[PDB]
Design a protein around this ligand. Sequence first.
Ligand code: BO9
Length: 354
Amino acid sequence: NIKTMIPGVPQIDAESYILIDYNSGKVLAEQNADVRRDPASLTKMMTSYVIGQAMKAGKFKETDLVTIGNDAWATGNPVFKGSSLMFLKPGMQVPVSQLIRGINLQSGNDACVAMADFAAGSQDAFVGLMNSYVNALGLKNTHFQTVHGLDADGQYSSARDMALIGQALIRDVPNEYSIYKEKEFTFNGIRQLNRNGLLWDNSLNVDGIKTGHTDKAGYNLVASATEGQMRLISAVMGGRTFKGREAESKKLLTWGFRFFETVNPLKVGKEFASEPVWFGDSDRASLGVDKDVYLTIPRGRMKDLKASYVLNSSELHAPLQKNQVVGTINFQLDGKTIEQRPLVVLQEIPEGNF
Ligand SMILES: *[B]([O])([O])[C]([C])[N]C(=O)[C]([C][C][C][C][N]C(=O)O[C]C1=[C][C]=[C][C]=[C]1)[N]C(=O)[C][C][C]([N]C(=O)OC([C])([C])[C])C([O])=O
């Protein structure tokens, strides 16, 4: 009973939430995770993702100066009334490094415009890139209309989708993601604090990602934290109170680490199994995976994990291509398969030549 316990999920004072494992993608807990909601500044994770991709591709670098245009003039555009702002003015020449911290640390709406025009020519073209990555990432309940996440009539996302955008930032653009734990930066002689309060919570190792409020969105937070081999991502959307804006997410993350763990039982290129092969230059095929296996299991069950496999075909016949799928690996706990991963050929086996 203690081994097989299913933990009760804490009550979360928000419209929707999800808690996932960064490495395995396992969903640990969820409520209304696919409900479409106003994303507020969570939009800026996608803005940041696009900028990170452009930097990874070498389109510009952190030291490059961006010349601020009229559309990013904080006090020249009443759309910015009451929003988080660097107070950019036209003609300023600001390093990319400073603008991306304005976006990431401070959720500067004006910085978002400045970077969008710099990276993509216009806000509309930048929003096209955002939505292109929505498609690339397979997100089913997200659509952006602007570069900053101010409430927009046809813009939406969901707790699942924002968690997946967080996962994507950490995974695909780690140099961009490393910025999010920085507690402060300085622009125009003024120190600006990272708005993610959880960075200062001694009880967790939180290192991201985005907190944000608008009137329609309520309190929103995508947080990520680590403990040993383990990284969790929480998305909590439509948080109902000011006092719960960090605490509700802290409840989820703390619960996650207490009841679950991440195991990495197999890495790419390492032999999980061997099988005979016919017609080859080798008599045996070395079999494993083409992607590191991460599983999320109840905490302390690692010693109970078992693994076995099945094969698609009776016989293996050369030529066998590298990463050719030949079976399935079943990972098991208490006699029941909990996870499956493709079993693939690790080293090519062409037809024998003698
Ligand atoms: B994200 O979630 O951080 C981001 C998308 N949210 C914000 O930027 C919100 C602003 C939402 C706009 C609603 N406010 C408003 O006044 O109405 C807009 C309007 C109405 C009519 C016509 C034109 C425009 N902003 C915040 O969450 C922060 C508030 C702001 N913070 C702040 O730090 O202020 C300075 C000036 C220092 C930047 C504040 O308190 O003024």
